[PDB]
């Protein structure tokens, strides 16, 4: 589990992912020292991959990042060796289309009454804005809410009526890209 993270040098305006490592666990990212990264439209932590997604690097992001993974079995947290990251001086990276870097599966079975959480986050400069919608044009029922600064869609009490194709749209001034996937039901 223990390895020596080489310091990684990134560019201002560059879309970046900090991988955790391993894949029923919960993930968080601390900055510099213990304890957490301020998540917002620009930074997103996935409970599905464990990684930290920085859509556009700001100079403030320079520092040590380390991934704490907790085991649902217990309250045990196992830290990784931090990744320190700096800025290149050789040039700023320009604007570009959003690139959806983590997203819900093309097809996603869901137990009756369970709570499904669709993830969708995108690297982009300017910082992408996430929108959600159904493919068939039907508006969402009230029980569906936008968590994690629009990076997650939460469907509680999943029922057959909630099945169908869900789209995730990410855009900025330079274009838009789309993640699609059909949710299915089973009891």
């Amino acid at each position: 589990k223990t390895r020596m993270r080489s310091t990684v040098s990134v560019r201002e305006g560059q879309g970046v992912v900090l991988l955790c490592g391993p894949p029923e666990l919960s993930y968080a990212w601390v900055f510099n020292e213990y304890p957490f990264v301020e998540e917002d439209s620009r930074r997103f932590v996935s409970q599905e991959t464990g990684h930290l997604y920085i859509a556009k690097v700001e100079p403030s992001d320079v520092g040590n990042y380390t991934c704490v993974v907790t085991s649902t079995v217990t309250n045990t947290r196992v830290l990784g060796s931090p990744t320190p990251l700096v800025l290149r001086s050789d040039g700023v990276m320009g604007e570009y289309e959003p690139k959806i870097e983590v997203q819900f599966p093309e097809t996603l079975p869901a137990a009756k009454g369970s709570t499904v959480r669709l993830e969708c986050f995108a690297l982009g400069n300017p910082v992408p804005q996430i929108n959600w919608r159904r493919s068939d044009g039907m508006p969402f029922p009230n029980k569906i809410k936008l968590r994690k600064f629009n990076g997650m869609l939460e469907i509680q009490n999943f029922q057959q009526e909630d099945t169908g194709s869900y789209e995730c749209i990410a855009e900025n001034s330079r274009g838009k890209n789309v993640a699609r996937g059909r949710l299915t039901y089973y009891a």
């Binding site: 990134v10 879309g15 991988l19 490592g21 690297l123």
Partner: protein, 258 residues
Amino acid sequence: GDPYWAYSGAYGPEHWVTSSVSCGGRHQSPIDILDQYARELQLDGFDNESSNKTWMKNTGKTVAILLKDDYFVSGAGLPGRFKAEKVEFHWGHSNGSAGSEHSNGRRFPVEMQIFFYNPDDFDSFQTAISENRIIGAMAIFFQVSPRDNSALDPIIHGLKGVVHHEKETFLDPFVLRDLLPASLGSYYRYTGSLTTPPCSEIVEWIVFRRPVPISYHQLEAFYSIFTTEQQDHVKSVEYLRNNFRPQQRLHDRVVSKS
């Protein structure tokens, strides 16, 4: 499982040999064709409009066009007829920057490659590769020009549709023939390899001497292409640019001319 490689850094071209043994051999491509020391083709279906099922993909190393119509090339000293499989591109940095793989010495902003196999003794390109058998490849130079080239509209429009690594799209109808030089007459021939790992030394090349016009404007859709880099525990979004392999050494090789 394929070896990680790139066009720069710890896994740039000069380090391919360490993971891909074939990259360190002789008869490697590209090379520098010398015209001073240099020295018929029949194209079937190139005159046809491509299918709406023919599609394009950003592979992170190039932009690939999976051809879904039947194109053939015969003659020019090839071991039989060859059927086209795919097209891939190589471009520079900006403002017409050299990005072509072959050259003499005069490099061009863009080089396009069309890859073939012989279907008389194989069923698919990917079988041919796995079996280390002979494949054909064309190399077509693009040179800057004052005016747009409408023959390339489907391709440029394609580029805009696959900006990011892994992105795919379908292409409007295009005519593969007009993706070739106005004059097919002057070209060269030699034995080489893939210009990417595994650098398999199994390729018969055709380098058309005359280039195809593109505008600076059309050129820009190539410089708008991104890729990713998986370094350590950090994945980053990067420009895909200067994606060409350094020219290799001829050794026991001679070029033909027609």
